Amino acid sequence: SVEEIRLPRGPLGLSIVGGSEPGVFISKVLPRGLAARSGLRVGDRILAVNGQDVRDATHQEAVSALLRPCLELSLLVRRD
Amino acid sequence: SVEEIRLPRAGGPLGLSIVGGGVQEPGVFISKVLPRGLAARSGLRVGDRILAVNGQDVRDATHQEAVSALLRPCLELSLLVRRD
């Protein structure tokens, strides 16, 4: 399954694992935090961030894409 | 939140995927668990973190090191797992 997630972005309230081709996964989600309230779940694979493919991104690149300045923070994730 | 899981590996498909080795939380991350597969029936779940395998620390294990530890000869396959 796939879906687009927009964060109202302040801590994001999630942790991620992986990076370079396993990919980048959400390892922890703070209950009632921003990521949790946005619909992100443990185990989700982050496919893209604001249109930027991160299927093959480094852990540092994934962190940077998520914290970089933007109009709206939008993610594409794959679960199950 | 920490458990000892026994995985009776019988040579068939184990039905899980793992991600090995900013901010990190320790252990080998279980990324995928096939519903009703061997790993699922054994008690493993997505999000779990394998801390050790038969007493061997795998907190810092690479993906292959973790695979080797899970597939090497042993009498029992006992996993130390942290769960949130």
Among the partner-chain residues B25, B32, B63, the one whose CB lies closest to the CB of A27 is: B25
List the alpha helices (DSSP H) in A1-80: 34-38, 59-67
Contacts of B29 in chain A (CB under 8 A): 17-18, 25, 27
CB A47 within 8 A of CB A12: no
Paired strand residues for A14: A29
Query: Is B47 within 8 Å of A27 when comparing Cβ atoms?
Result: yes
Fold observed for domain A2-78: Pdz3 Domain (2.30.42)
The token pair at A12 is 């994001």
* B47 to chain A, closest Cα gap in Å: 6
CB A68 within 8 A of CB A57: no
Domain chopping of chain B, boundaries:
2-82
SS3 A45: strand
* B19 to chain A, closest Cα gap in Å: 6
The token pair at B29 is 């991350």
Paired strand residues for A26: A16
* B69 to chain A, closest Cα gap in Å: 19
How many CB pairs below 8 Å do chains A and B form together? Answer: 34
CB A21 within 8 A of CB A45: no
Give the determination technique.
X-ray
Query: Is B46 within 8 Å of A42 when comparing Cβ atoms?
Result: yes
Query: Is B84 within 8 Å of A17 when comparing Cβ atoms?
Result: no
Resolution value, angstrom units: 1.8
Query: Is B19 within 8 Å of A22 when comparing Cβ atoms?
Result: yes
CB A43 within 8 A of CB A72: no
Task: Please state which of the four CATH numbers 3.90.1300.10, 3.30.450.370, 2.30.42.10, 3.40.50.10470 is assigned to the domain occupying B2-82.
Answer: 2.30.42.10
* Amino acid (one-letter) located at B43: G
Q: Which of B74, B79, B84 minimizes the C-alpha distance to B4?
A: B79
